[PDB]
């Protein structure tokens, strides 16, 4: 009557995902990274086509 919910979970260390150059790893860290890249990626289009 007093025990807590039994816990059969075995959680382990998760393998490393490249935190700077792995798409699903950067985004799940910093969701705004996708936008921030695309802003200057978009600006680079304007800059190069300008000349």
Partner RNA sequence: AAAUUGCCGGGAGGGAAGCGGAUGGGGGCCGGCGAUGCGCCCCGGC
Partner RNA sequence: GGCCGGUACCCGCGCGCCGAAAGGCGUGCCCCUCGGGGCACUGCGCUGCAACGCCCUGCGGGCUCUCCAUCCGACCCGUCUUGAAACACGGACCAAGGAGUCUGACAUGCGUGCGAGUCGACGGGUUCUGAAACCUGGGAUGCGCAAGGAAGCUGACGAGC
Partner RNA sequence: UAGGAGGGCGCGGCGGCCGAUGCAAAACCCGGGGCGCGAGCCCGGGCGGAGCGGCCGUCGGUGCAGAUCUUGGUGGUAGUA
Which of the residues 6 through 35 are near another protein (CB under 8 A)? 6, 14, 16-17, 19-20, 25, 28-33, 35
Q: What are phi and psi of 29, to 5 degrees?
A: -85, -55
Round to whole Å and give the CA distance between 28 and 13: 17
Residue 19 tokens, joined: 């935190």
Please identify which residue in 4, 11, 49, 51 interacts with another protein, judged by CB under 8 A: 4
Binding mask 11-30 for RNA (x = CB under 7 A): -x-xx-x------x------
- How many chain residues are in contact with another protein, going by CB under 8 A? 20
Round to whole Å and give the CA distance between 11 and 9: 6
């Amino acid at each position: 009557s007093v025990v807590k919910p039994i816990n059969k979970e075995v959680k382990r260390r998760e393998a490393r995902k490249n935190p700077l150059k792995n798409a699903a790893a950067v985004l799940k860290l910093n969701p705004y990274f996708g936008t921030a890249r695309r802003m200057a990626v978009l600006a680079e289009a304007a800059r190069v086509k300008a000349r």
